[PDB]
Write a protein that binds this ligand. Sequence first.
Ligand SMILES: [Mg+2]
Lengths: 34, 390, 54, 1319, 147, 49
Amino acid sequence: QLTMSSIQVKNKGSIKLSNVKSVVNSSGKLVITS
Amino acid sequence: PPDLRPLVPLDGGRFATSDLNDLYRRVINRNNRLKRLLDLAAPDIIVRNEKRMLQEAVDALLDNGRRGRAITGSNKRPLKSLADMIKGKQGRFRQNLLGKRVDYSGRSVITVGPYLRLHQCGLPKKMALELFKPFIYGKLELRGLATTIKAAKKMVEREEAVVWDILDEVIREHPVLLNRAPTLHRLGIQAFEPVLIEGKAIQLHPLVCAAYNADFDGDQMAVHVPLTLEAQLEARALMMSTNNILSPANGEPIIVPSQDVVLGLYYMTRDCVNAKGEGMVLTGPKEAERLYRSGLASLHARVKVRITEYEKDANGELVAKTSLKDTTVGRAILWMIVPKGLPYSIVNQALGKKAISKMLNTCYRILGLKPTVIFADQIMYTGFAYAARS
Amino acid sequence: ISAASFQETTRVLTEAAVAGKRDELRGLKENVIVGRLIPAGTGYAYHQDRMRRR
Amino acid sequence: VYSYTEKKRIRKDFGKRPQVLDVPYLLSIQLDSFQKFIEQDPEGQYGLEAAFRSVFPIQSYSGNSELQYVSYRLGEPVFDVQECQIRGVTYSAPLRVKLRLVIYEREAPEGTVKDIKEQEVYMGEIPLMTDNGTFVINGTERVIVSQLHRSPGVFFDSDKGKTHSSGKVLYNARIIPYRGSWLDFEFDPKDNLFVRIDRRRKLPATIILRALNYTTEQILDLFFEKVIFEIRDNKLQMELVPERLRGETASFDIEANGKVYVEKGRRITARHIRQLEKDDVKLIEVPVEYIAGKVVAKDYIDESTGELICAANMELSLDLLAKLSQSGHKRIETLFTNDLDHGPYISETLRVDPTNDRLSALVEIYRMMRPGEPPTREAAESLFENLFFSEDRYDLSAVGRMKFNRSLLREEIEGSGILSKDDIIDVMKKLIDIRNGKGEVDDIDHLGNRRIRSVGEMAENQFRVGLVRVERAVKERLSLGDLDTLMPQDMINAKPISAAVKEFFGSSQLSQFMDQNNPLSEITHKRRISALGPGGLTRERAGFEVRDVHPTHYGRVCPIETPEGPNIGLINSLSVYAQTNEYGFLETPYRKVTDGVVTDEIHYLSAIEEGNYVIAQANSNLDEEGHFVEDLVTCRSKGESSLFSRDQVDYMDVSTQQVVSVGASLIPFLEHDDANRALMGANMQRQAVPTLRADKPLVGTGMERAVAVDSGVTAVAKRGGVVQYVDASRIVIKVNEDEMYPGEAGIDIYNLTKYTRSNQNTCINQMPCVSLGEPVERGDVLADGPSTDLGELALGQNMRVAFMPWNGYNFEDSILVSERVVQEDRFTTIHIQELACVSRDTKLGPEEITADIPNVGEAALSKLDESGIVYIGAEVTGGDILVGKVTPKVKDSSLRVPNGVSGTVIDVQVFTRDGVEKDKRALEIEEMQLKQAKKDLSEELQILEAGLFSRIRAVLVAGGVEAEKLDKLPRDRWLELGLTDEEKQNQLEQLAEQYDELKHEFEKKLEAKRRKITQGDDLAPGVLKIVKVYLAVKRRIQPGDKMAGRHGNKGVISKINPIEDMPYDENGTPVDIVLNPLGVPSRMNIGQILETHLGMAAKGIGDKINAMLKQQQEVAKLREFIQRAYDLGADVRQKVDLSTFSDEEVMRLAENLRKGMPIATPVFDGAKEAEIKELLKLGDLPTSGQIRLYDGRTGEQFERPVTVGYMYMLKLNHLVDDKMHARSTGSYSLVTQQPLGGKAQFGGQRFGEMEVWALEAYGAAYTLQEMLTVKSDDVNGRTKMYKNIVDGNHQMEPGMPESFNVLLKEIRSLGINIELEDE
Amino acid sequence: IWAAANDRVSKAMMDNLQTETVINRDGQEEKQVSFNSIYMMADSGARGSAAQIRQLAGMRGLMAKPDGSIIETPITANFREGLNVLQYFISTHGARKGLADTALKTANSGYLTRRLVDVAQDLVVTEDDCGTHEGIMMTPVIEGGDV
Amino acid sequence: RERMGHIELASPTAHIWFLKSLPSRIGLLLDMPLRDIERVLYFESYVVI
DNA sequence: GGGTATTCGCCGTGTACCTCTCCT
RNA sequence: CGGAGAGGUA
DNA sequence: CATGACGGCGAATACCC
Ligand SMILES: [Mg+2]
């Protein structure tokens, strides 16, 4: 049977980031460094 | 040993190339030449050449073609060496040890048996007579109809009536194994109780076809007879189709109805807006069946039916609740084959393939294996009948 | 035995013969080849009875 | 206009496209190929003439004597086809070749002859092709399947990465001769050219050039353009042509007329180059260090010092340029080198080439060709010459040379069969410039690169192999022998040629046992194209690409008909109009479009030339003047399809069935079927078994007549005339006067084949389809063959089919069949089985065939005669004795009927060796054959005599009328009676002379035929006699049998339903077969539905005509209705005017139409749905094709309308009788003690590896153990098991299988100590 | 554009095929699930699917060349209307590709199955509980945006 | 089918399984390359013992 | 003399069943 | 009855 | 003699220090 850019959340829910740090920003929105 | 390398007679007079005795002959020839030059004390060049030739003769006998040109026979086909005897698909291990031809076996084209129960198969009586022959001989000796072996053989060859009665007696609960190649999973071989049928084709239960990946466009199947009590009980308890209704790969049922059974259930459980008999209030499924069979109500008519359903309580007893259901005539008719303990909502819908599979899942989860097998057989009978009637 | 019956029979048998290997009939293929009850299913207890007697 | 024969039953054609080209003779490829092989060719281009002229003259090593070929001829075959089939011998002609041994005068000046011995010599038997394109080899009918192979020539391929690093494309070229070594050139990842001869180890490419007597500077001149460095005083100024510098960056400030144009650091562009059109600078100064990355091209020496300062092709450096300059050497030679289009591949290959002259190249080539051999200069100088430059050992064929020159863009088509220096040089140059991105690689699967060899070409090749094998012996016996007075017969030993030809015709992969299930199977077998065989592919190794439908397959290879499974895409079917060209490339016809007008001029285009034109589709509407009615026609241009204006269109397809094969062309409504199911239907049409009664398809395509006629299974009138006599075995036609040769009676005799077995044990029976006194035209079918009905292919039966589920009996493609089908013998088939009984010569004594058999009762031998041979017509059953034989052990070795093969004895043949006293049954069989042969020389004598006397009557009453002498003087007194001659009997002297020659022809061969009957035929060594018994058995349809339509709708019968149980309509008519509708939607083979509808319509027409025949209506009424039926359609091409038919012809046609009007629906020009509904209206049938059915069991109406119509159903050769098999115990193999294999050997089923895996997964250890031991090679275990089962004890005592012991002994024989340990 | 046209044709065909009008108890029109035989077989799940229905009564759609590139002009006809010579020849490419793919993939599947059988042949449940505390951490399989 | 025979070889002969089957057991056991063993066994060279 | 990229020879490539001819 | 070749069925 | 298979892998080879 086998044959040989930018992220967008699509539903309601809380956001959780892991292995992430909080730093000062020019616009105030956190960058990622890890 | 020579009996492991025989010479096959061709038309009696002449023999085919054994492809193994030839290599032995070359080895013996070169050994004799080297011996008759060793005592001769011949010049060393020809003696060395003969030693070299004996060496290629020997390693051609052991592994022909492993080094250098493959020594060739009368035809261009390479000679088959000792190493070839034990390796490859045609080698000893794979062709004669990991698999082999067996006695008490047969094969035939498969046809659909729609009347069969899940644990039954349709065996041609000629195939059964040949397969169970020593059992027939034993039973003939037991009741004194055959004094000797030859008498029993003659009675079986003549196919006397008492021989057929004995054959019916022997196979009553002796399971047989049905197999369809390729055997991709254990369920490619399953056990069934044989039923003697006329003709020459094996009858297969529809619900096991999916397990076999079988259909009836030319497929053939092999049948095997478990001889011993241990083998018969293994067939019954381990391999019988009624004991193997769940896929070992994912745990899902394998005996879900397909094609015309699904079509029949779907057609009879469909609803029509203005079908004949709409708005009638029925005492139960029996009245719905009576109205449908008498032509007074359409199979898709939206009606009210008093339905008594059963639900398992905390301690496992079936508490009965009776209520008026807004349903169709066909759904009420199908309710009669639903075993107690299942809710009426499982049939109060247009039943497609997934709905039927879910109904079988619910029956297996609530009631167990035997009611599930009975329910599946009843579903298949009803589907066939109402697909025909549609 | 199992490796030889699988693939590369010449190489496997050469390795076994040079090393003087000894094969205990413990797997399914090995017992199938010698025509014994496999150490699984209904034969499993038999093999257990064979093992506990040694 | 319709002829009298075709007025019998006119098939209604719904085809709308006019037919511009007739379907060619479907067997033309085989006959034309064999004709080219055998026919005399004065030019010597084809066949036996060419093979002889390419091996002769056979000259001695010294050259004193040579054998010269003059001519050849093929003698009359000793036996014709039928006798060869009966006696089991090859149908062949003796090859008799006129040779001439020439011995020259010893130390003659030059070529002076001293004797010329011209003799005819026999070089063996050449198997002759039959009238239908088959061969009779050892009495068996075989087909030589045509082979599709890579054309000879030069082919440029590459690897699209996939071999080294990433995306590094390696290019290669292959010179493939028809005969000789393969020459390969290739690029390595470092861009060096390597050369391979016969797929050996790779050598540097420049070695071949060095062996072609090319030095380094010559090679550089061939593969590079010289740049010159013209130093006058200093600064290293550089003469060049501008164009060279384009593409690469500026190394120096290029100056124009003393003014710099572009400086360093700026890459030169196109505008830079175009500025130099009026800037013609030649001497340009360049930096000294610029020369560092340059190569000196020529070999330089100083004036008179004699020191090699620099040889050809080396990296120039500052020291080398400075010292070369200090000697006044004014001009420096370099090679032009770029990075993208002028790469130095040849230079680098030379840099890695170890060889440096012709001697080194030749010795290296010797070392590569003959590894392990130390070579003499002469040995290498001859080996290299023999590789590619001797006609005897190397041969580019005419097609090979043509393809080679075409690939290199050479105008010349003809050329030499051997390679030249320029050939190799041009191949290397094209490979290099393909690497340079200037050319393109070739398509391996393109049909312009794959050609066809048919029977003639491969037969000639094998004959050449035999000829050269004989040539070796002739040369050695000629040179080494002190020959004097010896005739050329002495040197010619015909055994090699005969052996090679017999091997080709009996054991070659393409010499295949003919598929003879039905005439369509024969046609398809004769038309298959095979990519397998010698020089082709292998089914285990062929990849996806070669199995794909290539765009060039259009009109040449059918994209539908190919075997399922391993052979898919490797075995193909020739397209209907496809034919091979002179070079063997498949070509297909097209109509030329001139000035926008679709003319009727037909041009056959091959795959190469077809891609250069715009070709319109066959489904393109035209007008009476030939112009395209639309202005945007769909066309194919270069393997792509798009729209074009009519002026662009260069060609048009000749027919809508051009792309399909014959089998696919026979599928009605093919365009409504999915290609997979169409493939299945085309494959299964060939497996249909001829039934008891041939039944025409109600829905056809129009190709049935061509298939039936071209197959040769029918009797076709050679000349027109009147049926003078007719019976089930014979037809005698009285030829028309206008078709008579002067000296003949005008009688044509057609003896019909009666109840003879086919290659698949089916019945071949011819029955006449003409009556006494009927007029017949040339090409008319006189007798139908198997599966033919009035000259139309009739593979199956028209079945009244309903599409509905019926209680599960049609589940998973199962078929429900009414008992009425069984009762009417619709699918009952005749099978003829041949049993042989051989009495041989044993050591103890000679085997005897007699009626005296021990240990058997008298009643069991009542069917045997006094000779112990079964009577003709005896109804035998399984176990009955056919031929009683005893071996002097006497043991009972009589030939018995195989179990369950109950049939009727229809023929007994007896073959006895010389010196054996033939038995009484042999004597009476001989007597019957003698009487029948005398009858064949007497009835065929008196019928021709009656024709001659009719012609004598006609001539004698013409100018020489003598009424009284007719009866007062018999017809035996016109020959010798002495009288003065006149015009009356001088003409009779020419017409009765042939009569008297039949007194010299029929009677003269009577003794020869008697000798042949009385002949004691040569049998196999040790065989005393052979008795062949032919058994005819009628196989009636039963559950388990396989049925199929033409649409891929296959199934197995599950039940024979009683007639009262079948669904029936309002008129009480039941359906014949109930098919499951649910197999239609997912399969998408909708044609079976449409055919069904059309079938219904067809039957409806018949249902009306039958009614009009039952009511005895006026002939005018039938005229009106049948004319309305034929006129129906949407502008169909067929026109049937009943007004031109007589009343009797109309009645005959209506009688032939009363069972249903045959309909023709071409595969892509077929009946539309609206036309089908119109025909349904004409028959007063519902336009939906669905009617109200009632359940026979209950009478209840089925709730919905059911599609009911007529489908044409085939019984396939997959009967359950042949497949059912069972075994409890039986014989066992010799080495392993496991049960035998096969139903024919009463063998057991193989419980293979996956079965054992299933048993292990169940944990059924005891069942597995009994499979391995008591049911297989455990000899003691199986005996104990059988005894225990007889005793009622279902218990086993398994032991060691013998196969394990065999394995242990085999490993021990390999010098390995394997053993079992203790317990 | 041709893919969008195929989607539109499929949507129109399914919309017209899946619903039928019927007189209600009163003389009023009402929409209901169609009783068309092909639609009933597909919707029930007995046989057929959306792709097969649109091949029968919609359009066959875009086809692929043997090398895999999509042919620019799709097959606008369906099996009821019948294909022309060009469309049929185009479809034979995919049909042959699929059949040969099955033929050459069955061997690879069998070889993989045999290798798996050997590597796992001797593994048998030999104990009730070994007493291990280690285990693997089972979470729902989520690739991002779907379960 | 159980009793085996023997052939007394006039000269010693190398077993191909222990020579050709990679890795060469004789070659690895002796550190002379398989090429030299092939040439010596097949009479193309000599070895000093 | 030692590490590592390239080469060369070997290993493997679905099951079951059916028909035919031909083979020291 | 072993092998080879060819074809076919699922 | 055949020259239409190819991917994976380990031992041997060669190249580059
Ligand atoms: Mg099938």
